[PDB]
């Protein structure tokens, strides 16, 4: 039932390595049985029911069963489970390529769209047909046989290269050893949490909860330098080899399909449409940010020169890679009176979660309830049920996986586990999502205390979760967050705006010790500090966007050299010689290839919606909130991103709000 929850979450998280392998073979056999049956149909015998409906039914059945197999590699604490899950992902990704390139299927869906009366089927079904045919041409199914075979074998090679690229980074266990003196300025609650060695030193890993505090707060330059070198040389050997194969393969496939570059090939499926639009966007934004970057670099150099003189260090007259975050942190403290280590005392994780849940309850008309004795993949994971406040309809469930551990995905991500689409029997499947982050653990007898940047990350990822939960479509391939890549960051970045509002922040904060609120003056300073370091922080994202475009545009380019080029020309902070940042650039292998610009691209849309609608009429207005759910989240991928933006804004978007929020124009 749409108003119940029992039995609607069919996910199991107690699979052994052997069961993962057995289930993978069973899923492939049963799924191939459906594609074979459709392929055996006479071309003049195909109908909506025996062809379109049959393929739609197997897509939802397959994607849900696939989740139980390919998700544990990201979260399971058992390394053998993670390894079996990775092997299942490799095998199922090759199987996905085989089925996607069946000419008999492509021939029959093409014949269905040409013969059936499109006017008498739902618009999302017409979208299913045209997108399916478009995907077929993007797989070369309209091309001769031997070029299809060449594309297939290359796509199979690329799927394993991408999986290995991220597997290497996920299982890396690099660590460094530092003495207490070498960890100067770092607080005791951080130091007293590290493992000690036989020489009374401390082991520090390259995980974010270790790397970031060292780079932001450690006053020993050599300590920051050794960490930056290790962080930007993770998997240097093996992942450079992967890039040296993956990037030419992407180019050669795009050429066979008729595109000049891989960047052109992927841009066609995004709202930006073309690479020349991306270049003009990044290049014009870079020029507007140039004066801010110069002023910020000047101030940082003055900070470093004074500290070197005070601490008696050598001064090299430049901003090294291992200096940037450290002096950006000082800029925040000095110019805006923001001490992140003091401010986190007001963000205990339970208060932040409570206020985050209450924000969506009041704004989007939803109800949240934590499930007790939930079936989860790790003891620290919690499960929540989402209902529509007015009707009681059970929209979905989401898991919260908030703390780091061995073998867990290091970054911050949202995972779609069940699509909120229609089932073969006509009923609606309950959507399921998982929020996976690595927040500071409880230490020193205190609850987990989140820095404001961790609260913003929490809100960012929860925006993805609610997009997955609120989206309801007929077909699984349009469900949840299956929108354009340069559009999927709109709901995530939209929610971040609620951590930069005074009244909202007052509701999210409560001192862990005496329950007192953040002082009014400090709240005003926190909100006004939103643009601190924005020049170099944004220019760094432009560097990443430019490197991503270039590595998928020019063919015979050294990725490390191309990164170093844009670091000097755009950011003004040289890349450390000997490092290879692109070899750690997981986005290049995680579906963001040629599309990393999408973060900045999405921010223009989210800022326009927040300023023009929410801020103009109250950012807690439930009427504007419900309009946002129905027009932006609920359609999922069943509508074009620009169409949903136009429905919400009632006009075309522009950069006025985006530029105004950056202190530009």
């Amino acid at each position: 039932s749409s108003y119940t929850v029992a039995g609607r979450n069919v996910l199991r998280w107690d699979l052994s390595p052997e069961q993962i392998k057995t289930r993978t073979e069973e899923l492939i056999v049963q799924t191939k049985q459906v594609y074979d049956a459709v392929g055996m149909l006479g071309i003049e015998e195909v109908t909506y029911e025996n062809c379109l409906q049959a393929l739609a039914d197997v897509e939802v059945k397959y994607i849900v069963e696939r989740t139980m197999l390919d998700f544990p590699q990201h979260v399971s604490s058992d390394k053998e489970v993670r390894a079996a899950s990775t092997e299942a992902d490799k095998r199922l990704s090759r199987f996905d390529i085989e089925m996607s390139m069946r000419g008999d299927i492509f021939e029959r869906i093409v014949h269905l769209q040409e013969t059936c009366d499109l006017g008498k089927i739902k618009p999302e079904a017409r979208r299913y047909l045209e997108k399916s045919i478009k995907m077929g041409k993007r797989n070369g199914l309209h091309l001769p046989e031997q070029v299809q075979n060449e594309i297939k074998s290359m796509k199979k090679r690329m799927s394993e290269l991408c999986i290995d690229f991220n597997k290497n980074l996920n299982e890396d266990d690099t660590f460094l050893v530092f003495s207490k003196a070498e960890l100067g300025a770092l607080p005791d609650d951080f130091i007293d949490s590290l493992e000690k060695t036989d020489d009374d030193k401390y082991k520090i890993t390259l995980k974010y909860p270790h790397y970031f505090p060292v780079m932001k707060k450690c006053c020993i330059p050599e300590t920051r330098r050794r960490m930056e070198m290790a962080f930007n040389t993770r998997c240097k050997e093996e992942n450079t080899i992967i890039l040296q194969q993956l990037l030419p393969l992407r180019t050669k496939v795009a050429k066979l399909l008729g595109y000049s570059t891989h960047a052109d090939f992927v841009l066609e499926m995004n709202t930006a449409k073309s690479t020349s639009r991306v270049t003009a966007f990044l290049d014009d934004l870079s020029q507007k940010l140039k004066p801010l970057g110069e002023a910020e670099r000047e101030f940082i150099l003055n900070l470093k020169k004074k500290e070197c003189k005070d601490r008696g260090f050598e001064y090299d007259g430049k901003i090294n890679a291992w200096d940037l975050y450290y002096y950006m942190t000082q800029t925040e403290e000095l110019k805006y009176s923001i001490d992140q280590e003091f401010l986190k005392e007001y963000f205990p994780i339970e208060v932040v979660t409570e206020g985050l849940l209450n924000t969506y309850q009041e704004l989007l008309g939803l109800s949240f309830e934590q499930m007790t004795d939930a079936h989860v993949w790790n003891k620290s994971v919690t499960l929540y049920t989402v209902k529509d406040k007015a009707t009681g309809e059970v929209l979905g469930q989401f898991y919260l996986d908030l703390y780091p551990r061995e073998g867990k995905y290091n970054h911050a991500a949202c995972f779609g586990l069940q699509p909120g689409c229609l089932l073969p029997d006509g009923s609606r499947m309950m959507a399921v999502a998982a929020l996976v982050v690595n927040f500071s653990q409880p230490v020193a007898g205190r609850p987990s205390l989140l820095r404001h940047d961790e609260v913003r990350t929490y809100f960012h990822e929860f925006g993805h979760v609610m997009h997955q939960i609120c989206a309801q479509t007929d077909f699984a391939r349009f469900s949840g967050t299956n929108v354009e890549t340069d559009f999927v960051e709109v709901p995530s970045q939209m929610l971040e705006n609620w951590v930069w509002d005074v009244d909202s922040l007052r509701r999210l904060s409560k001192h862990y010790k005496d329950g007192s609120p953040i002082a009014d003056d400090l709240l005003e300073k926190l909100v006004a500090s939103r643009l601190v370091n924005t020049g170099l922080l944004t220019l760094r994202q432009i560097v990443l966007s430019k490197v991503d475009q270039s590595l998928h545009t020019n063919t015979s380019l050294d990725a490390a050299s191309e990164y170093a080029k844009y670091c000097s020309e755009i950011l003004g902070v040289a890349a450390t010689p000997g490092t290879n940042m692109p070899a750690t650039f997981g986005h290049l292998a995680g579906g963001y290839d040629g599309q990393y610009y999408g973060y900045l691209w999405s921010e223009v849309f989210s800022m326009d919606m927040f300023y023009s609608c929410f801020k103009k009429e109250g950012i807690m207005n439930p009427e504007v909130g419900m309009k946002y759910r129905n027009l932006i989240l609920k359609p999922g991928g069943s509508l074009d991103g620009m169409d949903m933006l136009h429905n919400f804004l009632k006009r075309e978007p522009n950069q006025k709000a985006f530029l105004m929020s950056r202190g530009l124009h």
């Binding site: 990201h74 970054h411 911050a412 991500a413 949202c414 995972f415 779609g416 990350t457 960012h460 990822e461 993805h464 967050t481 999927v488 995530s492 994202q541 990443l544 650039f585 997981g586 986005h587 995680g590 579906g591 963001y592 973060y599």
Partner: peptide, 6 residues
């Protein structure tokens, strides 16, 4: 899956 900025 969906990722945050690097």
């Amino acid at each position: 899956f969906l990722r945050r900025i690097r």
